[PDB]
Amino acid sequence: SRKKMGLLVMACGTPYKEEDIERYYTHIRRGRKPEPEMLQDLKDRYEAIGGISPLAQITEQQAHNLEQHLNEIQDEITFKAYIGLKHIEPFIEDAVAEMHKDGITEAVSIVLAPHFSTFSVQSYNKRAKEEAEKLGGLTITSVESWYDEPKFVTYWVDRVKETYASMPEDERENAMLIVSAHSLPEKIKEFGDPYPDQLHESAKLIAEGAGVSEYAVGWQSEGNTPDPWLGPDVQDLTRDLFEQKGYQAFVYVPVGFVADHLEVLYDNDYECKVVTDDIGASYYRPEMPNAKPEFIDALATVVLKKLGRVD
Numbered sequence: 266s267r268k269k270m271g272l273l274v275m276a277c278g279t280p281y282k283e284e285d286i287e288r289y290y291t292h293i294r295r296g297r298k299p300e301p302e303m304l305q306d307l308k309d310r311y312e313a314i315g316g317i318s319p320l321a322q323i324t325e326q327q328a329h330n331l332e333q334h335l336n337e338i339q340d341e342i343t344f345k346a347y348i349g350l351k352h353i354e355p356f357i358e359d360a361v362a363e364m365h366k367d368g369i370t371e372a373v374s375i376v377l378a379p380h381f382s383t384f385s386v387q388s389y390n391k392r393a394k395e396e397a398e399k400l401g402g403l404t405i406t407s408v409e410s411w412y413d414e415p416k417f418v419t420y421w422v423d424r425v426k427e428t429y430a431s432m433p434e435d436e437r438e439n440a441m442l443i444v445s446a447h448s449l450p451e452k453i454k455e456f457g458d459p460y461p462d463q464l465h466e467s468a469k470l471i472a473e474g475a476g477v478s479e480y481a482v483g484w485q486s487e488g489n490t491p492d493p494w495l496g497p498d499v500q501d502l503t504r505d506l507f508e509q510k511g512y513q514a515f516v517y518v519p520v521g522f523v524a525d526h527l528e529v530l531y532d533n534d535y536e537c538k539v540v541t542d543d544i545g546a547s548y549y550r551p552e553m554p555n556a557k558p559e560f561i562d563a564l565a566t567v568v569l570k571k572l573g574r575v576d
């Protein structure tokens with residue numbers, strides 16, 4: 266007889282179809298509906314990246330594959346995955362309510378973003394716990410960060426090694442590795458938020474494992490508020506590094522992101538590519554984890570370590 270546990274997998278969320286762009290972005294913008302020109306622009310961006318339907322499917326596939334893999338690799342717990350999202354249904358509170366309705370009394374949560382922040386991870390975890398407390402009779406232990414899981418570092422190390430090995434000799438000797446995550450408001454620093462330090466440590470670990478001595482850290486995808494967000498932005502960093510040293514290849518590792526969503530397919534593969542094309546450099550951006558077995562095994566290890574069932 267196995268112990269039953271909920272596996273609460275949390276993420277930003279994505280629209281499910283083009284007609285969800287308005288409500289998704291209204292939610293991100295804290296109730297401010299995008300103007301018509303912006304709605305049209307967003308539609309065009311999603312069309313440019315190959316469409317919307319594949320996006321939420323990745324997150325669902327990650328949760329599904331993680332549940333099945335956890336259930337196969339150990340014999341003590343049977344997990345059932347529930348997805349809880351920030352900016353579109355199913356919302357975090359919906360997922361917790363569904364766990365409670367289904368009879369779950371004990372759950373472990375993980376956010377599909379490897380670095381802790383007060384703005385995102387801590388807020389998701391607190392919301393999940395608050396809903397559990399309101400319903401009663403259900404407890405959640407929450408993963409806070411996992412950027413330093415060795416299997417996750419190794420995923421990116423090996424992707425970087427493959428990219429550098431694929432380069433012509435002249436690029437391989439004159440390339441720059443840019444390691445990035447989603448920008449957040451700079452005011453997180455008032456709380457001692459470790460998010461920037463964790464990104465810098467991811468970059469150090471990945472560059473070290475891959476044997477890449479020239480790398481830099483940047484941020485991407487900042488939102489639209491009056492206070493400053495973490496920088497430099499990858500677009501500006503790329504140009505600055507080019508002006509300083511003349512790199513002829515840029516390799517983008519958006520380690521803060523786990524899937525082929527707009528922030529990678531457009532904010533790297535279009536916006537950074539515009540800059541590398543303008544300066545005459547080659548652009549590389551290795552495969553995101555998505556739902557691939559190597560990444561799912563890394564997440565399974567994160568979960569079982571959090572529960573103390575793996576050293």
Ligand SMILES: *Cc1c(C)c(=O)n2c(=O)c(C)c(C)n12
Nearest residue numbers: 277278293378385447448521
């Ligand atoms: C939607 C989204 C993703 C994937 C992410 O990592 N983040 C953030 O950090 C914010 C603030 C938002 C929105 N998102």
Ligand SMILES: [Cl-]
Nearest residue numbers: 381409410459
């Ligand atoms: Cl942490």
Ligand SMILES: [Mg+2]
Nearest residue numbers: 282283284285
């Ligand atoms: Mg339609």
Ligand SMILES: [Mg+2]
Nearest residue numbers: 329330333334
């Ligand atoms: Mg399966």
Ligand SMILES: [Mg+2]
Nearest residue numbers: 409410411413
């Ligand atoms: Mg830790």
Ligand SMILES: [Mg+2]
Nearest residue numbers: 485486487532
């Ligand atoms: Mg942008």
Ligand SMILES: [Mg+2]
Nearest residue numbers: 490491492493
């Ligand atoms: Mg500003």
